Amino acid sequence: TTQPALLRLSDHLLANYKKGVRPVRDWRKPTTVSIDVIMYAILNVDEKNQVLTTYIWYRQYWTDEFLQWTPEDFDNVTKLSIPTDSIWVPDILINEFVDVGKSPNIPYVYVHHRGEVQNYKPLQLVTACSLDIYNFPFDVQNCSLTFTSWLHTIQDINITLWRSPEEVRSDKSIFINQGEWELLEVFPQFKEFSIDISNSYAEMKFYVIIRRRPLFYAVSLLLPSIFLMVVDIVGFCLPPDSGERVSFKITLLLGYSVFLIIVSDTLPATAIGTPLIGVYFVVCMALLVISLAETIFIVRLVHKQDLQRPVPDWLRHLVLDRIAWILAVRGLLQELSSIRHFLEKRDEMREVARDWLRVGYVLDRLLFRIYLLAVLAYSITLVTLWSIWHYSENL
Amino acid sequence: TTQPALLRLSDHLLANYKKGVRPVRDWRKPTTVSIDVIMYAILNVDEKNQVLTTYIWYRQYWTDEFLQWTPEDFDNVTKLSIPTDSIWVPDILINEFVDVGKSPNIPYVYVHHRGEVQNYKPLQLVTACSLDIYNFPFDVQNCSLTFTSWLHTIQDINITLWRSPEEVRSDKSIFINQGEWELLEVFPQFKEFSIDISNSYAEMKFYVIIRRRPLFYAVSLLLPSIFLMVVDIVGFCLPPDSGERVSFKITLLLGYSVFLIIVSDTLPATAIGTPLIGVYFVVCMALLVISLAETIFIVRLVHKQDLQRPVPDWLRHLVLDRIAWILAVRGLLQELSSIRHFLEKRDEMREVARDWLRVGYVLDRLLFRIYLLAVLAYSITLVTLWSIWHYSENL
Amino acid sequence: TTQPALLRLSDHLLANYKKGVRPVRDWRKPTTVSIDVIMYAILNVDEKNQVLTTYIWYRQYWTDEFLQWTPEDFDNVTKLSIPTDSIWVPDILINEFVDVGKSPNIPYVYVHHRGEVQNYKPLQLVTACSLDIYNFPFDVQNCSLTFTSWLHTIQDINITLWRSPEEVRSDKSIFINQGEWELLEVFPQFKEFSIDISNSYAEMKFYVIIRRRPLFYAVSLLLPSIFLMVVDIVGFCLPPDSGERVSFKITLLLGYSVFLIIVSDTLPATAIGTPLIGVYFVVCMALLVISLAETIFIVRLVHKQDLQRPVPDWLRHLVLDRIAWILAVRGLLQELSSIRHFLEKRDEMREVARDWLRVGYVLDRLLFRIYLLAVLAYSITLVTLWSIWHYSENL
Amino acid sequence: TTQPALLRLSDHLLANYKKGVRPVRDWRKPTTVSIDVIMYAILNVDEKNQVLTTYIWYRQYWTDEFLQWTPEDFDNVTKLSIPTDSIWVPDILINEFVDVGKSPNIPYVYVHHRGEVQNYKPLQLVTACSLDIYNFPFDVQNCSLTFTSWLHTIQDINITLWRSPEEVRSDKSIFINQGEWELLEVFPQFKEFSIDISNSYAEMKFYVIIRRRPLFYAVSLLLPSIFLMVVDIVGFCLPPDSGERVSFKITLLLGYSVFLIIVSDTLPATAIGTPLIGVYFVVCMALLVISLAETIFIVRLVHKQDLQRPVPDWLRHLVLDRIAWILAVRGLLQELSSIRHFLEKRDEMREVARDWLRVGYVLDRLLFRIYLLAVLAYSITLVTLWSIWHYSENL
Amino acid sequence: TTQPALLRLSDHLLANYKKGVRPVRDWRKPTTVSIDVIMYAILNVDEKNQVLTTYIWYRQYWTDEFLQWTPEDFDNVTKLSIPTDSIWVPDILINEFVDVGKSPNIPYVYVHHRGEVQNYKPLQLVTACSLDIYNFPFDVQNCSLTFTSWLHTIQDINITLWRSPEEVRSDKSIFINQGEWELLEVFPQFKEFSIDISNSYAEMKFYVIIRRRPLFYAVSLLLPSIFLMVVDIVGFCLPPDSGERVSFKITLLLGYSVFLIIVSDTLPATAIGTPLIGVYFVVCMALLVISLAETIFIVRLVHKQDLQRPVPDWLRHLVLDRIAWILAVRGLLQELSSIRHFLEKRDEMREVARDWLRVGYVLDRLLFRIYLLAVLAYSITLVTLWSIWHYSENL
Ligand SMILES: O=C1c2cccc3[nH]nc(c23)CCN1[C@@H]1CN2CCC1CC2
Ligand SMILES: O=C1c2cccc3[nH]nc(c23)CCN1[C@@H]1CN2CCC1CC2
Ligand SMILES: O=C1c2cccc3[nH]nc(c23)CCN1[C@@H]1CN2CCC1CC2
């Protein structure tokens, strides 16, 4: 009577109570813990080592059947807070743990009448996910979390949800914005696990769908690459100025290399595969340097005064292409004759060499048409990728 | 009597006292903890992962109503220090915790008569903030801290301030100088939190305003970029020396690229957006390389002796631009005739080609005027940014 | 009777039981712990410091001979869970530990009748392995783990397997896919260790075979290097255009250098040796720059009008190569004579210099044949490497 | 008697003794702890985040007035070692703590008669200092440490020195050599701290003076920069070979850029200011590129055959500079006349253009004299910096 | 009798035994702990912060004189294992500790009769060593470890070796191969330490000799640098083709710069000094760029038609070098005279300019001989370095 209600209740409950045993009056009936998880934020995502870092708010509740008392004797007190180190605590944790999680400690738990026990805690989960960068700008990731007791079997601990699944699937009330990645949904699913028959352990599967935000990467990658893509408009109806034109084209190639290496060194870290953007980048440059090689080989072969190939080989190339397509006065007089030939040999040879440059000219415009076809294919596959992303958001 | 006062008081108080329960004689009345926070320093700010690291000095006080004694019996002692592990300690912490905070431990607390209990501690807070780099040189950040009990509700623990808010808003007595970022104000605000009706948890909001120092970044970015901006004075009344001038302009472009890549690789780490300085940088270079492309296309098209376009297309371009603007002796005689034409063909063709370079010249000065307009817009938007920063300091 | 079975059994067992001693009723008989390890994933592999990070699921079982009771008295309960801090736990650990392993804690253990005690735990092993990068694209690694008691001898603790070794050798039921490295087999072997006679300590050897996946590295290294390998097709029947050809070849060398340095700076981290790919890369470039040096030396030596070496040295080089192979009218008349020689000296000297370029031409095609032989050797050694890898998978 | 002296003394002292209270028989008299710190090494200094890492050996002593006994009864034992967890330990620590310090634990303390208690410990201090890089090669830093009790006031704990300050100021007996930074002095000073009147807390200020070693940085920076500074000797009496000279000067500029960027990327990390060496580096390059711009503008303006500016503007520039300084036979005859002018127009125009290059030449030598003046100023300010450093060592 | 021997012995020994005091029956006699250390591996060595990371196996033994019993009463049991937290443990540790060492815990210790107590533990030591990179490829390091009690004096704890020193000096039975660094010897030495007279603390010095493996660094540094060293064979009997030769030499310089910067950025991290290889690298490049400067200055000074220096200065340079060495028909006739001079002025001036290039040629071959002398000095100092390394292995 003189003692306060809280101290009397704590003395009546915590006394002569052994921790470390399952609080069930009959050993056959298993205890059922129920859990609930709320998304807070995605701290960091990296694809060099397949590591996902997230932050969850976790709450669990179960029945501690030893902790019962009559509220009518204890001055109407239907609430109690006790240290978490003095009662039973189940070992429910995630199946994979690349680290400890460096979780803070909350050393208080709730105790209602009729044995209800609740526990709240924040958790920082660092795990491993099967990340893929098949579609880099428009990426969706399906990660998994597995809540399971590491030692107890299905005859001891079973897992259940606090709320209906439909409410869990839509949870954005706590997720903070201004982040690189955003939550789409969380899906719970009850599975049964077993590796070796004798024992069957319970399981709780949480599927998380995460979608990237293609704004900063899109702006920093697609816009400036397309803008510096100027060989398309330069190579249209190319003149025979290749000699100095490809000198500047090789300068431009050096600039492109710089642009390719800074981007490669900073953004991609996929160690198992390649995005489609990278391989199409690669093949576009492949046939650009090939166009360079053809347009330098032509001018180098016609450069000299040997008129390219005077042997019957150009006609063969043409026909195969078509098939696959389907005294003193005497001295002064002799003086006159020697002058003319020298005065007109130079410009004649120069103009004959220059006139062979239509043979020079051919076939580069054709592979330019092939380049335009490749550009159109790249644009249409980007459009289809955006369409795939739009379907990906259909949830 | 023979025993000293301190040991007698400690024996009288710490004995038969159960920790882990709320020290209230009636369970209905909630206990009220009050807090106080002082800024020390901003350790590190990075925008790659939205992480803020700060250092605070924290003090809290409340009423431990079990710890009461009469000073007239205990030889006039109105002060007491006891270990912090032997009494009740509330679980007031910040809502977000990207890490533990790696806080040191101070295992002593104050105990006055009439149940007053005070606690001092230093805290190293590492949190997540909605950082934005919309205005890079002149940046202001509004971060938030949320002191809240992780388990107890509003019927158990309520939060209050030790001092008046106006004193808290101006606190620079401890903040150390010589740092990259500086404190502006700290604002407390009492909110009520609830996610699900049944329970309502208290809350304590601390809004921190942090302003950057634009000295080293300004000196290292705006001054040398403006100084190496010399194409403005080079491109004024450009002569027809473009052939070798744009060879050196492409060299200058390579140098600019180097300057752009070292800066890009080191300073910016925004993964969600772009500052205005970056995009204006981008568009200025965009139309600089466009000026390069036009001034090389012109000289390459007039380079050869085909007099550019002898077809009626230049007149069309001009009119569309205007609309949008709104025996022996006989042999010696025949010898004379052949000489002259050859002796005067070369210089004539050269001078006719050179004379077509006014048509060559046009329209680059016009896009140079467009460049000057862009430069003026950049300067005026920098001025307006500085004005926005001056308003931002108005607090 | 009134008390539940679990509490009565825990009180009967845990009471008056001293931990920290070996639970054997006769001290002569040693206790035998048995272990079992399952692969989960390979977290990270790096060759800069010879560090291997893995994840294992570990279970051990032994006989705690003090913990015995009759199930017929205790209401048929053949299962028990007790805290792991209240009984004896052997100190079985790995011999090498570059770090602690940052393992989570599972504070519950199983206790059956007749003294059976089982323990489950996850372990994150970070160790040191004798990694070799002799064969980089097609690599196989043989790491070792050594389970051993750090203090107890063979007269106290002996190690045994739970299951037959043949089942342990094939374990892929838990290993997660989508990783850089994949498991091949785990092999257990019982060894006896001793450094100094007096004492003999037991040991448990686990040999792990890990095979790399050559997809992303192969695509990013062999395909683009082979594609940019174009000097092979350029250098075939090289013309005497070397003057500007090697100017572009040196440009290409600069590009190759860039390609070599980004790759070197990012992928290889071997600090003790070299892969065969690197050294063959090195020697191929060696003789490419040597071809460059020869083809510039030739054109520089024949460049001037000194006709290369008019001294009898070229014949010596040829023979050593073959051996190792096994008044007024008079004034006008005098005017005529002076003109001709000047009008025909220039082109004559030019054509004589040009005609000496067959001597110029020789021997570069021969070292080109040597280059082709080196390329063939590189291809055939790559084929043999793939064949070695195919044998390596034979397990 | 039969029991040994040590066990009897430990039983007599440690028994019935309450820890967690101040060991003073009268509560009014404060206890006085005294400290002593010895420098060991400076582990790491970085200016990106203002972090100082040091290593100290710390010893403290005070009077535990409860721990007294008569040595004449306890078999002459004037020395005792007891665990540090069983008695009172003051909470004296440093005011700033960017981390915990990761200090090892020494769980033994000394206990003499008459209550003397001593404690030895090593500490690894990581703190924040107001680092400045105003004078980079010749730098001196003044860091501060503040030993203070985090909770107790001046009426409870006071701080004193073990030894005289003069001995503390000279302490190099433990400092290890072969380090980047070296100790100069440690200065103790007793301050009184208070933020809010009611309470006054004690304080112990340790000022540390640290001086850098300018050997490796000096060798790697000043010697090679001065050596590659060759434009000074090249630009002396510059000839009119600017056309190809500034082509190589721009090549040299590229090399200088490389030298500037590797150094910038590796050594400086000041985020708040600039050293004088950097700004003088910047201004020297500023007017070097300005000399480049002037010497290219001149040759480009005189390049063409328009004789630079034939308009009366060069005279204006000169005067402003001075002010600021303070049938058949007829056909053959007509044939002769046409030849001469063509045969002598070319070389005449060439020589007239070449002769205008004295006007070309002027004023670059004058700005070269300005460059020499800047070089002399740089040398003299380096000399004055060395003199400042020599005064800085005066201690 | 009914109770087992182990439990009876543990109850008889661990009961009524106070830990935290020195187990000596007379306080005057000091206790003597003996230690033994075995090398396992060298985890990481870096010279940016003078940090050494090693792994040791440590065992200590001493006499716990309270723990004695008669084996004839306790059923012949001469072996015992007890937890390490229940008895006295000396605080023997290393003097320097840049970190904690993150050592695992082995909570069991051996106890024989007659008070013998042994303890085994693995230790991961991270320390500070006076590393020097004076001789980079052929380096030997002499590190020190100091086992000492941090609180107890020579009157309480003395250090001794378990085995003879000669056996300790040769210990390679546990060291793992395939590492960057290898063990040479470990040398123990007994020192006496004192800083301040009153007290004298014991000490145990372990000198470790570590020798690098010069295979990967040698292959990656000396072979390719020597191979790309081709200016030696190019500069031999240099022709007057310098104009384009030094254009390619400056290209080669750019390539050398790239080679120098990647290597500098990756391998060296010495912050206090320089290796001899670096400074000889520096001086070789110094006089290579000086050769470049001389050979460009010569050709630029003779480039124009001013015949270099027609002033009497070349003779002065030569002599100082030698000293330091120790009507109509009239019109047609006038027409003839004007032709000849123009027809023969050009080639005459060209050949006179070309003929002045022997004066052009001199002195570069002489500084080439100086280069060859420098190369020979570099080779001979490398040979002497290898000889020093061979003596260094003499142990
Ligand atoms: O995490 C949850 C939480 C978890 C799981 C289910 C939940 N429903 N409603 C909530 C909640 C809200 C309660 N908190 C937090 C924990 N304390 C501090 C912050 C919130 C308020 C009480
Ligand atoms: O470290 C030592 C060791 C230390 C110091 C001296 C030593 N002599 N002989 C040895 C040893 C061998 C014993 N182990 C190890 C510790 N346990 C696990 C591995 C070894 C066997 C027992
Ligand atoms: O740190 C100090 C020390 C501190 C403060 C004052 C000091 N005076 N003399 C010393 C010392 C020397 C004592 N040690 C060390 C601590 N143990 C291991 C190494 C030394 C010897 C005893």
Dihedral sign computed on CA atoms, order C274, C279, C280, C285:
positive
Q: In whole angstroms, give the CA distance from residue C6 to residue C77.
A: 8
| Tokens of residue C381, six digits | 């050694």
Query: Interhelix angle for C328-355 vs A328-355, to 10°?
Result: 30
The type of residue at E44 is N
Rounded to a whole number of angstroms, the distance between the first and last alpha carbons of chain D is 61
Nearest to A94 by CA among A130, A54, A64, A62: A54
Q: Which residues pair with E160 in a beta bridge?
A: E34
The type of residue at D187 is F
Q: In whole angstroms, give the CA distance from residue B129 to residue B148.
A: 18
Q: For residue C30, what is the DSSP state?
A: P
Give the distance from residue D124's alpha carbon to the nearest chain E alpha carbon, in angstroms.
7
Determine the atom of ligand 2 nearest the C-alpha atom of E57.
1
- Residue pair D195/D169 in contact (Cβ under 8 Å)? The answer is no
Whether A188 and A243 share a structural domain: no
In sequence order, what are the residues at sequence separation of 6 or more whose Cβ sits closer than 8 angstroms to the Cβ of residue E11? C18
How far are the Cα atoms of C297, C312, C321, C325 from residue C315, in angstroms, in the given order?
18, 6, 10, 15
| Tokens of residue C48, six digits | 């800069």
DSSP secondary structure of D223-242: HHHHHH--HHHHSTT--S-H
| Tokens of residue D26, six digits | 């009268």
Domain range spanning residue C144? 5-213
Nearest to E48 by CA among B125, D45, D109: D45
- Residue pair C273/C135 in contact (Cβ under 8 Å)? The answer is no
Neighbours of C236 (CB within 10 A): 10
Residue with tokens 């967890």: D85
Residue with tokens 């120098």: E260
Whether C128 and C181 share a structural domain: yes
Taking contacts as CB-CB distances below 8 angstroms, the residues of chain A near B150 are: 106, 120-122
Q: Which residue owns the Cα nearest ligand 3 atom 18?
A: E150
Residue with tokens 């510096």: A228
The type of residue at D370 is I
Q: In whole angstroms, give the CA distance from residue E294 to residue E306.
A: 19
- Residue pair C74/C8 in contact (Cβ under 8 Å)? The answer is yes
3-state secondary structure of B251: helix
| Tokens of residue B166, six digits | 């106006």
Burial grade of D161 (CB within 10 A; 0-12, 13-18, 19 or more): middle
Whether A131 and A267 share a structural domain: no
Q: In whole angstroms, give the CA distance from residue C338 to residue A171.
A: 103
- Closest residue in D to B240 (Cα) is D304
Q: Which residues pair with E142 in a beta bridge?
A: E209
Whether E225 and E209 share a structural domain: no
Residue with tokens 């020192």: E191
For the sheet with C109-111, list strands across it: C81-82, C109-111, C116-127, C51-63, C31-46, C157-161
Q: Which residues pair with D37 in a beta bridge?
A: D58
Burial grade of D228 (CB within 10 A; 0-12, 13-18, 19 or more): middle
How far are the Cα atoms of A300, A363, A371, D75 from residue A297, in angstroms, in the given order?
5, 12, 19, 106
User: Can you give the three-state secondary structure of B12-41, one letter per residue?
Assistant: HHHCCCCCCCCCCCCCCCCEEEEEEEEEEE
In sequence order, what are the residues at sequence separation of 6 or more whose Cβ sits closer than 8 angstroms to the Cβ of residue A286? C227
User: For residue D157, which phi and psi values (nearest 5 degrees)?
Assistant: -130, 130
Neighbours of C52 (CB within 10 A): 24
Q: In whole angstroms, give the CA distance from residue B103 to residue A240.
A: 73
Nearest to D127 by CA among D111, D108, D109, D141: D141
Task: Tell which one of D120, D168, D173 to mutate to probe ligand 3, the residue whose CB is within 8 A of the most ligand atoms.
Answer: D120
CA angle D302, D304, D306 (to 5 degrees): 85
Q: In whole angstroms, give the CA distance from residue B304 to residue E357.
A: 39
Rounded to a whole number of angstroms, the distance between the first and last alpha carbons of chain B is 61
| Tokens of residue C317, six digits | 């080089």
- Interchain CB contact of C265 with E (< 8 Å): yes
- Residue pair C127/C145 in contact (Cβ under 8 Å)? The answer is yes
User: For residue C7, which phi and psi values (nearest 5 degrees)?
Assistant: -65, -40
Whether D36 and D80 share a structural domain: yes
Query: Interhelix angle for E328-355 vs C328-355, to 10°?
Result: 30
Calculate Rg over the CA atoms of chain E. 39
Nearest CB to A128; choose among C11, C41, C340: C41
CATH code (residue C90): 2.70.170.10
Q: Which residues pair with A159 in a beta bridge?
A: A33
Dihedral sign computed on CA atoms, order D282, D284, D286, D289:
negative
Residue E272 CA neighbour count, 13 Å, CB half: 15
Whether A250 and A310 share a structural domain: yes
User: Considering its fold, how many domains does chain D have in total?
Assistant: 2
| Per-residue b or e along C180-198, where b marks 16 or more CB atoms closer than 10 Å to that residue's CB | bbebbebebeeeeeeeeee
Nearest to E281 by CA among E65, E137, E80, E69: E137
Q: In whole angstroms, give the CA distance from residue B294 to residue A239.
A: 16
Q: In whole angstroms, give the CA distance from residue B17 to residue B63.
A: 16
Whether D112 and D260 share a structural domain: no
DSSP secondary structure of C234-257: HSTT--S-HHHHHHHHHHHHHHHH
3-state secondary structure of A119: strand
Q: In whole angstroms, give the CA distance from residue B74 to residue B80.
A: 12
Residue E37 CA from chain centroid, whole number: 25
Neighbours of E55 (CB within 10 A): 21
Q: Which ligand is nearest to the CA of A173?
A: 1
Neighbours of C123 (CB within 10 A): 17
- Picking from E180, E213, E246, the residue at the C-terminal end of a domain is E213
Q: In whole angstroms, give the CA distance from residue B175 to residue B338.
A: 95
Q: In whole angstroms, give the CA distance from residue D234 to residue B370.
A: 40
- Picking from D186, D213, D240, the residue at the C-terminal end of a domain is D213
Checking DSSP bridges between strand C31-46 and strand C157-161, what pairing results, if any? parallel
How far are the Cα atoms of B374, D245, D297 from residue B234, in angstroms, in the given order?
16, 20, 9
The type of residue at B141 is Q
- Interchain CB contact of B329 with D (< 8 Å): yes
Calculate Rg over the CA atoms of chain B. 39
| Per-residue b or e along C343-366, where b marks 16 or more CB atoms closer than 10 Å to that residue's CB | eeeeeeeeeebeeebebbeeebee
Burial grade of B67 (CB within 10 A; 0-12, 13-18, 19 or more): buried
| Tokens of residue E395, six digits | 């142990």
Ligand 3 is surrounded, with C-beta below 6 A, by D 36, 38, 57, 59, 120; E 95, 148, 150, 193, 195-196, 201
Rounded to a whole number of angstroms, the distance between the first and last alpha carbons of chain C is 61
The Cα diameter of chain B in Å comes to 158
Q: In whole angstroms, give the CA distance from residue B56 to residue B39.
A: 5
Q: In whole angstroms, give the CA distance from residue D329 to residue D327.
A: 6
Whether C190 and C338 share a structural domain: no
Calculate Rg over the CA atoms of chain A. 39
In sequence order, what are the residues at sequence separation of 6 or more whose Cβ sits closer than 8 angstroms to the Cβ of residue C246? C292, C295, C296, C299
- Interchain CB contact of D243 with E (< 8 Å): no
In sequence order, what are the residues at sequence separation of 6 or more whose Cβ sits closer than 8 angstroms to the Cβ of residue D296? B248, D242, D246
- Picking from A184, A213, A242, the residue at the C-terminal end of a domain is A213
Q: In whole angstroms, give the CA distance from residue B259 to residue B220.
A: 11
H helices within chain C, ranges in order? 5-14, 165-169, 216-228, 231-234, 242-266, 276-303, 314-325, 328-355, 357-361, 364-392
CB spacing of A213 vs B27 below 8 angstroms: no
Burial grade of A48 (CB within 10 A; 0-12, 13-18, 19 or more): exposed
Whether D380 and D238 share a structural domain: yes
Phi-psi category of residue A16: left, alpha or beta, with phi > 0 → left and psi -120 to 50 → alpha: left
Whether C304 and C363 share a structural domain: yes
Give the distance from residue E234's alpha carbon to the nearest chain C alpha carbon, in angstroms.
9
| Per-residue b or e along A104-117, where b marks 16 or more CB atoms closer than 10 Å to that residue's CB | bebebbbbbeeeeb
Whether A140 and A45 share a structural domain: yes
CB under 8 A, 24+ apart: contacts of D310-314: D314/D359
Q: For residue A30, what is the DSSP state?
A: P
The Cα diameter of chain A in Å comes to 158
Taking contacts as CB-CB distances below 8 angstroms, the residues of chain C near A20 are: 10, 82-83, 86
Whether A254 and A359 share a structural domain: yes
User: For residue B116, which phi and psi values (nearest 5 degrees)?
Assistant: -65, 130
The type of residue at C341 is H
Query: Interhelix angle for B242-266 vs B276-303, to 10°?
Result: 160
- Residue pair B97/B16 in contact (Cβ under 8 Å)? The answer is no
- Residue pair E131/E42 in contact (Cβ under 8 Å)? The answer is no
Taking contacts as CB-CB distances below 8 angstroms, the residues of chain B near D265 are: 262, 266
- Interchain CB contact of E383 with D (< 8 Å): no
Secondary structure element (H or E) that encloses residue A207, with its range: strand A201-212
Q: In whole angstroms, give the CA distance from residue A109 to residue A92.
A: 16
Secondary structure element (H or E) that encloses residue A297, with its range: helix A276-303
Resolution in A: 3.8
Cβ–ligand 1 contact at B195 (below 6 Å):
yes
